[PDB]
Subunit: 119 residues, 4 copies
């Protein structure tokens, strides 16, 4: 089961600067305003739904992503996230890619930000 994105607000849209899109940190918010339900892979799918939306608004896609940074509270959780990341960046793989332990907002287990070319 895939899912629909949260509506994009002013602050969740990211910013476009000299032809590059810099998404904000996209968390696994549903269109309710609630952390989606599941283990960490389900949250990751949601983060991706949210990525796809703000990419699309800004005139970008996963194919023009040139960097993606994964935030998580525990580096143990990386492998499950990367399991999921591989379905979206598959035959395209962003040239640079960081994972980085961080305080997430309440009930979030994963946040992703991406830099992307706006053709």
């Amino acid at each position: 089961t895939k899912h629909a994105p949260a509506a994009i607000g002013p602050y969740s849209q990211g910013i476009i600067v000299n032809n590059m899109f810099y998404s904000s940190g996209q968390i696994p918010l549903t269109p309710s305003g609630e952390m989606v339900n599941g283990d960490i892979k389900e949250q990751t799918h949601q983060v991706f739904s949210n990525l796809k939306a703000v990419l699309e608004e800004a005139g970008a896609s996963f194919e023009t992503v040139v960097k993606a940074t994964v935030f998580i509270a525990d580096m143990e959780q990386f492998a499950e996230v990367n399991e999921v990341y591989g379905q979206y960046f598959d035959t395209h793989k962003p040239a640079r890619f960081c994972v980085e332990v961080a305080r997430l907002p309440k009930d979030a287990l994963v946040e992703i930000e991406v830099i992307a070319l706006v053709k």
Copy 2:
């Protein structure tokens, strides 16, 4: 919480120009940056870190032109000590924020 401790490092989340009561410092980018540094003081001390133990700092701002002003303040809390690394990034800040700073620090 204002961050996470892992493996003797502290990783602050971004501090914005709020007073302790939570009302935004309505004032120019230098006034705001002082308040951000005052929030950094507290989260650092709360974690058993200090300014001296900051090894990275990352500045988020709307316009790269506002760096000179932020730096003139950065350099008053970090003068005898200068973190070894520092990034500066253009970003959309929360409402009325002109500056936001994150820090990585050693917890001794």
Copy 3:
């Protein structure tokens, strides 16, 4: 080689402060900075990029105290355009170098 290009992005090698004649440059940290900018300018036009399409710069610097000065020079070359991201970092340079500079750039 000095560079690689992926997904339309030029990812430059660290440009140290050498003259075209092969020799470290004759002076203080500004002159070095200038030379690194003259050097970078050529590696960029070669790639289908320019200063105007730079999006990140990493300043490797020997002594973080001298950034005020590297930055006076960064301002000259990125005057109208300022890249949206940059980092400064302390590092071990080739003997005699006080500064080295990498950029990420767009190749339209």
Copy 4:
């Protein structure tokens, strides 16, 4: 080629997969990545730091396709501790270098 120590932190230069003998090692990327780690072992232990004290690693690879391999290797030494951050980046390497790691580590 040494690396740096500041505010109790080791900042390694980038370890390519060379033997004790100056010789580029005989292998796939998996065998290479084991040599890089051999050489990280050394410079880490000379600096006053172990693999357990690494707070960040960065991997340079010439093809992002080979990351799932390097990451398996990575897994063996960064097992019961994982560095709190890591990056991976496509850059150019020098000779028959598929892989290249620098790292940042605590010291006392």
